[PDB]
Write a protein that binds this DNA or RNA. Structure first.
Length: 40
RNA sequence: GAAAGCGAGUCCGAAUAGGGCGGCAUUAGUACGUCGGGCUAGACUCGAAACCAGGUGAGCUAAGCAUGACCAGGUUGAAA
């Protein structure tokens, strides 16, 4: 698959399309611009 | 972490002690080569008594079977 995890930190707007992501993973993206996108 | 799975966190547990991990002041690898050593192969070299497989042997020897051969001379003296 493809998971998204929260390690890096600088803040900015970017929309990711990972096949999976963690809690604060998402709750870190949009929280600075961008959209986490999981398969339907 | 047994795993689902969760994620810089995660397994114990019903939350608070710990184990493993990140951060730790720091810190990358990977491909090819020479080499040290490991592993699996006969595995530094040489040596076994033995075990297993297929065949060669009764022209020696142990016996069988068919067909032939041989036993001076003397002694004794059974039945009838």
């Amino acid at each position: 698959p493809v998971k998204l995890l929260a390690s890096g930190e600088i803040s900015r707007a970017v929309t990711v399309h990972v096949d999976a992501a963690s809690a604060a993973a998402i709750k870190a993206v949009e929280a600075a611009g961008g959209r986490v996108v999981l398969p339907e």
